[PDB]
Design a binder for this molecule. Structure first.
Ligand SMILES: [Ca+2]
Ligand SMILES: [Ca+2]
Ligand SMILES: [Zn+2]
Length: 528
């Protein structure tokens, strides 16, 4: 028996919900710490085990004691409830920084020295080049181009959608170059910078990843990882995904860093030149390389995104000839890392409408709305109001949820205003912060049941008891895709297929592209 709620808190002007397992309505009260009832209501069935208590009408800020039946809970209402968790979600990218000293005054207990500072050998050859900076991808120390592109795209979109909300947030500012950019762009730049080093000059092609041949033990501190670095071969996926991220960066950084902006635009055009002279061949790990593959068989949604990004970057109507036939395809319109068509949809919809066929544009917006309707229909049959169903609870189910909430919010910028856009965004935050069958807050160092044991090298390696805060875990994975999950979570419903265990990498790992949609969604909720 337990009350299920958003354990970070609620916005004064936001919807306020709690969940309980019950088979009957039942009264509830919210109280000041001294015990005085301030709000009273009745619970409502959402089926089957689940009942819901709505306390949206309570607009007074403060800490409240929520009581229903014989259960009690600590509830926080604040005009800016999600500020701290937002900062921490953004600061995570700075905690992931490679090849740069993280001082104790910024990083606290999780401070460390500049790691992976050696040059990397181009696979097969005897050449070696520096690819320093950027982010450790996930629980490991690999730096992969494809998932990196999603991470930067999300942070750039977050800045240009919700700059005011991100302004209240502070990164590891002293680690970064001065003058200091807005928090989202400041963080994203390190990664845009690492990444420009990943492009082969005299080809324009981009190396798929820079990793050690295999994973170090879960014990390895960032700077005890002294295995040689290798650059896996140039891939179509990495090149096209690089092209779209750089063309995106070229636009956004224009008023902040003209030199970076111009450098990214030229890098994007060179990458697209490579795509036109090469074959859409899926990446596979070369022999001897055992790290994260980030493979993918479909590369048309990558070409789509790369084409639409250059369409918006240039405003040149000539790009629409390439983009629009690709937008017709029955590709899933998703937000990566493998299926990136929706990013292309967004750059095309945000392109000035004069440089674009208005007939195709209406079809694209019509398909987007119909989808949003499909996601809305899922949300209204789910007890927790999230656009999910059992089969969606796969590896990184939290990202699946966050991307879908992001899709509702992105669409508001292109004239597609779905009525459920903001309740879904709130329900997504609630679920992520504890409103789920496990009562589990899926972010490290937050809520009343925080993630304690993430599959995260620096968190496992250190003698620090608490993990790096602000890390969003993958979430419930029905496919039980690691030994711990198999032995422990067999036969439980999809939403309970999670264990806070450090060896459960398929349910409890972190990722740079799992934090990036979280930053977008939380920044959306903060900006009213
Ligand atoms: Ca793809
Ligand atoms: Ca620790
Ligand atoms: Zn490193």
């Amino acid at each position: 028996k337990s009350i299920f709620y958003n354990q970070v808190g609620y916005l004064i002007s936001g919807d306020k919900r709690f969940w309980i397992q019950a088979h009957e309505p039942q009264p509830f009260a919210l109280r000041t710490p001294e015990g005085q009832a301030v709000f009273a209501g009745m619970t409502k069935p959402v089926g089957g085990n689940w009942y819901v208590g709505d306390f949206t009408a309570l607009r007074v800020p403060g800490t409240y004691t929520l009581t229903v039946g014989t259960l009690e809970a600590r509830v926080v209402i604040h005009r800016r409830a999600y500020r701290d968790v937002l900062e921490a979600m953004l600061r995570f990218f700075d905690y992931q920084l490679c090849g740069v000293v993280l001082p104790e005054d910024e990083a606290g207990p999780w401070a460390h020295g500049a790691c992976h500072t050696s040059d990397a050998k181009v696979f097969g050859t005897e050449r070696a080049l520096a690819c320093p900076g950027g982010w450790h991808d996930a629980g490991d120390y690999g730096k992969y181009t494809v998932p990196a592109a999603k991470a930067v795209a999300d942070l750039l979109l977050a800045h240009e959608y919700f700059p005011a909300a991100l302004a209240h947030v502070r990164p590891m500012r002293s680690v970064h170059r001065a003058p200091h950019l807005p928090p989202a762009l400041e963080v994203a730049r390190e990664e845009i910078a690492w990444l420009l080093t990943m492009q082969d000059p005299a080809t324009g092609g981009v190396y798929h990843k820079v990793t050690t041949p295999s994973f170090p033990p879960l014990d390895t501190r960032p700077e005890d990882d002294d295995a040689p670095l290798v650059l896996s071969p140039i891939s179509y996926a990495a090149t096209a995904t690089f092209c779209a991220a750089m063309a995106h960066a070229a636009l956004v950084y224009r008023p902040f860093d003209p030199a970076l902006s111009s450098c990214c635009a030229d890098a994007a055009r060179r990458a697209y030149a490579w795509l036109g002279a090469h074959e859409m061949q899926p990446f596979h790990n070369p022999d001897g390389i055992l790290t994260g593959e980030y493979g993918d068989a479909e590369l048309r949604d990558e070409l789509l995104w790369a084409s639409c990004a250059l369409l918006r970057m240039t405003g040149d109507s000539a790009w629409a000839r390439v983009c629009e036939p690709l937008l017709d395809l029955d590709l899933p319109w998703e937000l990566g890392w493998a299926d990136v068509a929706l990013y292309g949809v967004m750059d095309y919809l945000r392109t000035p409408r004069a440089a674009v066929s208005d007939d195709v544009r209406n079809k694209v917006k019509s398909r987007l709305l119909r989808e949003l309707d499909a996601l809305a229909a899922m949300a209204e049959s789910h007890p927790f109001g999230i656009p999910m169903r059992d089969d969606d609870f796969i590896w990184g189910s939290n990202m699946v949820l966050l991307n879908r909430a992001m899709a509702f919010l992105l669409a508001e910028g292109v004239g597609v205003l779905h009525p459920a856009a903001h309740t879904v965004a709130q329900r997504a935050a609630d679920y992520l912060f504890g409103a789920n069958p496990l009562g589990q807050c899926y972010v490290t160092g937050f809520g009343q049941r925080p993630v304690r044991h993430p599959h995260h090298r620096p968190s496992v390696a250190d003698d620090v008891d608490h993990p790096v805060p602000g890390m969003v875990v993958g979430g419930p994975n029905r496919h039980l895709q690691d030994e711990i999950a198999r032995a422990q979570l067999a036969g439980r419903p999809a939403m309970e297929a999670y264990i806070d265990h450090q060896d459960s990498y398929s349910t409890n790992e972190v990722a740079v592209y799992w934090n990036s949609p979280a930053v977008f969604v939380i920044a959306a909720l903060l900006e009213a």
